[PDB]
Design a protein around this ligand. Structure first.
Ligand SMILES: CO[C@@H]1O[C@H](CS[C@@H]2O[C@H](CO)[C@@H](O)[C@H](O)[C@H]2O)[C@@H](O)[C@H](O)[C@H]1O
Ligand code: NAG
Ligand code: NAG
Ligand code: NAG
Length: 606
């Protein structure tokens, strides 16, 4: 369709399927296996990208150009890499991926939304969609086109260190929250075929339903372990949200480290090809987890040649290598050269990677929009995050007897108030895992508002606010306080580091609450990624709030404490009496909760 140097795949007016087929038919084996290769930015250089025909890059947790980098620095790094890819013979742009799982959370000054467990408390899919929209703007502000989200794990045991990344133990709440997908990607057309990938264009990102499948169902919530359950139960609990994701055009699926009934997901042809591709009709690309194929064997990495054979024959399309791309390319090349992996398997993987790249507009807009840089940390997104934090909060108790004056809401005007606890003035603690660093971090790691700063911003100017992190009983009894707000809880963690059999918060925590609440009426704010042992915190507290991991906008806590808004959140998980009861989920024969799924006390706006 015109000029003498005309190449169909480069024509933006031709249909995706014709541009894919036109490009695939021109590629060498090296170009094909290049597309199937994702590498860390930490090992990428122009020459590596160009000479290996690399298809994708990622930032893993904490993989950043430097500490405190601006949105423009991120854009320049991504463009740098993309310039190299676009200089290859075929000019195939790379897709850059990142864990934007509660905002663009590796980026300094990015808005940090509550983690998924808290969003589950909101029962507000439309709020989660809005979070998806804001996240896509903030990811595109940094030049990135691909978010590894959403986690549609169904956590069935809160000893799992990723329990906070699950919206709920109820598959129905996880299904409702797949509205994240059309937030990140855009709404699919009215006509849409379930399983086709979709991204609206340069102001949206590709999404990733992960981790397929049963990441939330491991024995003793041990991260990466064995999910022991029959076909009926995998299909009734862990699968359904994958179908919702297909209907909303999720562009990719990341495979789980976990096994189903002793079979590595990363080697499971029946589930990856039989079910996801041939039954659910997935037409996007399937990506590995991080060294996922390496972990097929025991030990991990002890037969990479197997790892490649088993993972690629199971139907995986793109491999998050992510460092040793030379070994990955050499070994897949040999298996194809020896007839062990047929060319048709390579062509199907490359067809799906190119389908996603063409669909999402990457060949038309391979470079970053410098005008999107101001989207990062935009006050409108913060206001959204604040709304979400507030709606996430679950009021567990509001008066020590039925007869007491309810403590909440608190008055903004009082002569003197106490704000206390390890978590009252710690932005890192309130964001948790996957914030600036992989495992999250302590203190003032990014832009935000702690509980202490929110209280000072909220109260009447005549109200004297005293901060003491760990005050003793005498300090409180002598200080002349009207009331105390005390904030304690879990430290930041992710995945295996947060696997935890006893689920009790670190000291000082209980001690500071007992010391404070012993001397003056107290509202306790519990910062956690999951239910933890709570009876002793309750027994001491006049009121207690489960705030989960509310993110950067701490004023969402104070919006409810002080009666600007009523408490509306409902537990999206069972709150246990004792860890010995676990696993224990809404529905089981032997169901004895401290607080059932769906519990939450209410208040009214003053
Ligand atoms: C992420 O940085 C490196 O991360 C892994 C955590 S694992 C895996 O990472 C994927 C890509 O970041 C995520 O999308 C996925 O949900 C996770 O399961 C860790 O092993 C490395 O030590 C860390 O450097
Ligand atoms: C589960 O964890 C144990 C150790 O805690 C490990 O040795 C075993 O191989 C794991 N099982 C699976 C199938 O991943
Ligand atoms: C409980 O488990 C965690 C993680 O394994 C551990 O760090 C913590 O010290 C333990 N707590 C108690 C009370 O033993
Ligand atoms: C809160 O408002 C509800 C809804 O009308 C009402 O039933 C309840 O009595 C109110 N409680 C307080 C403490 O104002």
């Amino acid at each position: 369709h015109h000029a003498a140097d005309y190449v169909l795949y480069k024509d933006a007016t031709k249909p995706v399927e014709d541009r894919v087929a036109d490009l695939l038919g021109r590629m060498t084996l090296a170009e094909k296996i290049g597309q199937m290769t994702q590498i860390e930015r930490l090992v990428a250089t122009p020459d590596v990208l160009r000479d290996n025909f690399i298809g994708s890059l990622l930032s893993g947790g904490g993989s950043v150009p430097r500490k405190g980098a601006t949105a423009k620095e991120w854009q320049d790094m991504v463009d740098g890499f993309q310039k190299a890819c676009m200089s290859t013979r075929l000019g195939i742009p790379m897709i850059y991926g990142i864990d934007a799982v509660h905002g663009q959370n590796n980026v300094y000054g990015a808005t940090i939304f509550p983690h998924n467990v808290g969003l589950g408390a909101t029962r507000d899919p439309y709020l989660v969609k809005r979070i998806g929209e804001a996240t896509a703007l903030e990811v595109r502000a940094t030049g990135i086109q691909y978010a590894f989200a959403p986690c549609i794990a169904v956590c069935r045991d809160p000893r799992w260190g990723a329990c906070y990344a699950s919206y709920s133990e109820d598959r129905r709440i996880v299904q409702s929250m797949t509205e994240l997908i059309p937030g990140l990607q855009g709404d699919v057309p009215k006509d849409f075929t379930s399983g086709m990938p979709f991204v609206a264009g340069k102001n949206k990102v590709a999404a990733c339903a992960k981790h397929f499948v049963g990441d939330g169902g491991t024995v003793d919530g041990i991260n990466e372990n064995n999910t022991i359950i029959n076909r009926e139960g995998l299909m009734n609990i862990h699968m359904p949200a994958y179908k919702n994701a297909m209907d909303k055009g999720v562009s990719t699926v990341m495979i789980s480290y976990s096994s189903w009934n002793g079979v590595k997901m990363h080697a499971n042809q029946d589930l990856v090809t039989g079910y996801l591709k041939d039954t659910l009709k997935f037409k996007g690309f399937v990506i590995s987890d991080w060294e996922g194929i390496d972990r097929i064997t025991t030990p991990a990495g002890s037969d990479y040649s197997y790892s490649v054979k088993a993972s690629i024959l199971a139907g995986l399309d793109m491999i998050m290598v992510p460092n040793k791309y030379q070994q990955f390319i050499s070994i897949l090349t040999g298996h194809v050269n020896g007839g062990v992996i047929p060319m048709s398997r390579i062509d199907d993987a490359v067809t799906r990677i190119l389908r996603v790249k063409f669909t999402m507009g990457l060949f038309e807009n391979p470079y970053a929009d410098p005008a999107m840089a101001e989207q990062l940390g935009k006050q409108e997104h913060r206001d959204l995050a604040r709304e979400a934090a507030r709606k996430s909060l679950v009021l567990l108790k509001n008066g020590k007897t039925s007869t007491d004056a309810p403590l909440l809401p608190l008055p903004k005007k009082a002569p003197k108030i106490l704000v206390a606890g390890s978590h009252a003035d710690n932005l890192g603690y309130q964001c948790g895992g996957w914030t600036i660093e992989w495992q999250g971090d302590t203190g003032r790691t990014t832009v935000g508002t702690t509980i202490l700063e929110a209280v000072k911003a909220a109260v009447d100017p005549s109200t004297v606010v005293v901060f003491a992190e760990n005050p003793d009983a005498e300090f409180v009894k002598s200080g002349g306080f009207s009331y105390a707000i005390v904030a304690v809880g879990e430290h930041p963690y992710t995945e295996t580091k947060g696997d935890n059999l006893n689920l009790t918060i670190p000291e000082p925590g209980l001690s500071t609450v007992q010391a404070v609440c012993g001397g003056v009426r107290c509202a306790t704010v519990l910062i956690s990624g999951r239910p933890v042992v709570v009876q002793p915190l309750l027994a001491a507290s006049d009121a207690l709030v489960a705030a989960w991991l509310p993110g950067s906008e701490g004023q969402g806590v104070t919006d409810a404490l002080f009666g600007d808004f009523g408490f509306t959140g409902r537990l999206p998980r069972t709150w246990f009496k004792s860890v010995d009861q676990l696993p224990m989920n809404v529905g089981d024969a032997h169901y004895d909760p401290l607080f059932r799924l769906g519990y939450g006390l209410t208040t009214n706006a003053t």
